Amino acid sequence: HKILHRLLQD
Amino acid sequence: KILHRLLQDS
Amino acid sequence: SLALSLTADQMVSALLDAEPPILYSEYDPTRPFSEASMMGLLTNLADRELVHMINWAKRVPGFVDLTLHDQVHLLECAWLEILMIGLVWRSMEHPGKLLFAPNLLLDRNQGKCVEGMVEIFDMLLATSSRFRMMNLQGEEFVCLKSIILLNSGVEEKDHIHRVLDKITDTLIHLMAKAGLTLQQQHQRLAQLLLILSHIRHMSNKGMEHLYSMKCKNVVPLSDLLLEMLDAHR
Amino acid sequence: LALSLTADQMVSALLDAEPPILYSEYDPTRPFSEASMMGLLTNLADRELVHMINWAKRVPGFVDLTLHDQVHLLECAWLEILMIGLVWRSMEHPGKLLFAPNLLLDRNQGKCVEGMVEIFDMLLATSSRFRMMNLQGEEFVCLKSIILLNSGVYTSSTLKSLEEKDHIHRVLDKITDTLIHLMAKAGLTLQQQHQRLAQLLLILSHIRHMSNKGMEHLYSMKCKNVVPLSDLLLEMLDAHRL
Numbered sequence: 001h002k003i004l005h006r007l008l009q010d
Numbered sequence: 011k012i013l014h015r016l017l018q019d020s
Numbered sequence: 021s022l023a024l025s026l027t028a029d030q031m032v033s034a035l036l037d038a039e040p041p042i043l044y045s046e047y048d049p050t051r052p053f054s055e056a057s058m059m060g061l062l063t064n065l066a067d068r069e070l071v072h073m074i075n076w077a078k079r080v081p082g083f084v085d086l087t088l089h090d091q092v093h094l095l096e097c098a099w100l101e102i103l104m105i106g107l108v109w110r111s112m113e114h115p116g117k118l119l120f121a122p123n124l125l126l127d128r129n130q131g132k133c134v135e136g137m138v139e140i141f142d143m144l145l146a147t148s149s150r151f152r153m154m155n156l157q158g159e160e161f162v163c164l165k166s167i168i169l170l171n172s173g174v175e176e177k178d179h180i181h182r183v184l185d186k187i188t189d190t191l192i193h194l195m196a197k198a199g200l201t202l203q204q205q206h207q208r209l210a211q212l213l214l215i216l217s218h219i220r221h222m223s224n225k226g227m228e229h230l231y232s233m234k235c236k237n238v239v240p241l242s243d244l245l246l247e248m249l250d251a252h253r
Numbered sequence: 254l255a256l257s258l259t260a261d262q263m264v265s266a267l268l269d270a271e272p273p274i275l276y277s278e279y280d281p282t283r284p285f286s287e288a289s290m291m292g293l294l295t296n297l298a299d300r301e302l303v304h305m306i307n308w309a310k311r312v313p314g315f316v317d318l319t320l321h322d323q324v325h326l327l328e329c330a331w332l333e334i335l336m337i338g339l340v341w342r343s344m345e346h347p348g349k350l351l352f353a354p355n356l357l358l359d360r361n362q363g364k365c366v367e368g369m370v371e372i373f374d375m376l377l378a379t380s381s382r383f384r385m386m387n388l389q390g391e392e393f394v395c396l397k398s399i400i401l402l403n404s405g406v407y408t409s410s411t412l413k414s415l416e417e418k419d420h421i422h423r424v425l426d427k428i429t430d431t432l433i434h435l436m437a438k439a440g441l442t443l444q445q446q447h448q449r450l451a452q453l454l455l456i457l458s459h460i461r462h463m464s465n466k467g468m469e470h471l472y473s474m475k476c477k478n479v480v481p482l483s484d485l486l487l488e489m490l491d492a493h494r495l
């Protein structure tokens with residue numbers, strides 16, 4: 001859970 | 011100019 | 021896993037495929053430039069570029085083999101570097117200038133609106149003219165991007181190293197194909213990889229007075245830019 | 254011109270250009286504070302810097318550059334060079350860092366200096382890297398002279414500035430030559446040569462990162478007035494802020 005965390009799972 | 015001096019040393 | 025058996029050429033096509041496009045900037049050539057507006061356009065530019073980058077990364081062969089945490093870390097370390105290589109490359113054909121966007125090609129004295137910028141400007145221009153004189157190739161460019169991504173952080177420490185040896189192989193392959201002697205291949209590989217040092221240094225300088233260009237709050241920086249910026253320092 | 258050297262000649266002139274290992278202000282009679290630690294390392298460096306100029310003058314081709322170009326490179330690379338030098342030293346001391354034979358530190362002894370441990374662990378990792386790749390003395394010297402000639406090469410006006418840059422690039426091309434010649438003699442596959450070369454030069458960008466963060470804290474320390482820097486060490490820093 002971190003902007004860059006979810007944008008790598010989308 | 012310490013550096014500069016030191017290189018100028020023969 | 022299966023990224024390690026990619027041939028030299030499957031990897032070249034694989035990267036050219038994953039390449040982000042070139043973006044336009046929120047740019048009104050009516051308003052002259054200040055510290056505030058100048059940071060306005062770049063964090064807007066780089067904000068969008070960041071999203072392509074994240075997606076680019078995942079099409080970087082062997083990148084998705086890394087646990088989530090590893091992938092986060094690399095992107096957290098290389099993002100500005102990668103931005104900066106990309107910028108240096110599209111700035112190639114424009115001596116004395118920096119092609120931020122097609123609508124935003126900047127020359128040196130416009131980095132003066134922001135303190136500490138002009139110095140990084142000179143370093144970038146320098147790299148640009150090194151790319152020109154070396155006549156870097158598109159196919160070489162995307163390999164360096166791959167290296168930067170995989171090298172900024174650097175069984176689990178092996179996988180990336182293997183991939184790194186694959187990209188070297190690949191770089192070698194390209195110089196081979198171009199018709200270079202064994203002595204030219206090795207010399208150029210060295211000249212390529214030493215530019216990366218410089219890119220690293222450029223990335224470190226920008227991070228410095230962009231951590232202070234956050235404190236001296238001259239511009240909002242998106243939640244992501246802050247996130248990227250705070251875990252770096 | 255030093256282009257006219259064989260690989261062997263390149264190696265020898267680098268191995269005997271080598272600086273001497275120095276000692277730290279010994280028998281410390283006081284516990285370690287941030288101030289004290291930073292006095293040992295700063296005294297060390299400041300003394301090491303005088304022998305770096307000497308070693309630099311003896312790096313083939315270096316002397317063919319003009320004073321301001323020589324200042325630039327040294328001004329640019331002094332702490333990378335210090336840090337590769339360190340890394341090499343600490344080679345056979347896993348988990349420690351031999352700043353001097355009588356200052357052999359492990360990581361818990363950076364706990365007191367804001368920013369040390371972090372930089373310390375990177376330097377520890379690099380040591381591990383070299384051990385794992387079994388870097389060689391003759392490769393080591395090549396690396397370090399690369400760092401010297403490379404770090405400020407870009408940072409051009411009339412063929413005097415220009416031809417000055419083809420020159421260090423020749424010299425650099427030579428070090429590459431001589432690096433592969435070494436890898437071949439150690440009996441490595443041509444595929445292992447280009448892979449080795451690459452891995453070695455990739456560490457050079459990790460060293461850059463080393464120096465930059467180190468420089469950052471070194472500036473923070475200065476303005477916090479924690480340790481008294483020498484006049485030379487004052488100017489080495491002030492080049493990375495202008």
Ligand SMILES: Cc1cc(C)c(B(c2c(C)cc(C)cc2C)N(CC(F)(F)F)c2ccc(O)cc2)c(C)c1
Binds near residue numbers: 058063135137140
């Ligand atoms: C979000 C963001 C990101 C960067 C990398 C930049 B800077 C930046 C600059 C110029 C100067 C300072 C003092 C700080 C920063 C962050 N920058 C540096 C350069 F122009 F000097 F090269 C940059 C480079 C490439 C790119 O695509 C976007 C921006 C800015 C202003 C904002």
Ligand SMILES: Cc1cc(C)c(B(c2c(C)cc(C)cc2C)N(CC(F)(F)F)c2ccc(O)cc2)c(C)c1
Binds near residue numbers: 366372470
């Ligand atoms: C004049 C001077 C130069 C250096 C590189 C250092 B530092 C340094 C340290 C220890 C911590 C910080 C926060 C900043 C610096 C510059 N340093 C860092 C390391 F030990 F963490 F790696 C160092 C490296 C090699 C060497 O021969 C001597 C010192 C110090 C304390 C003083």
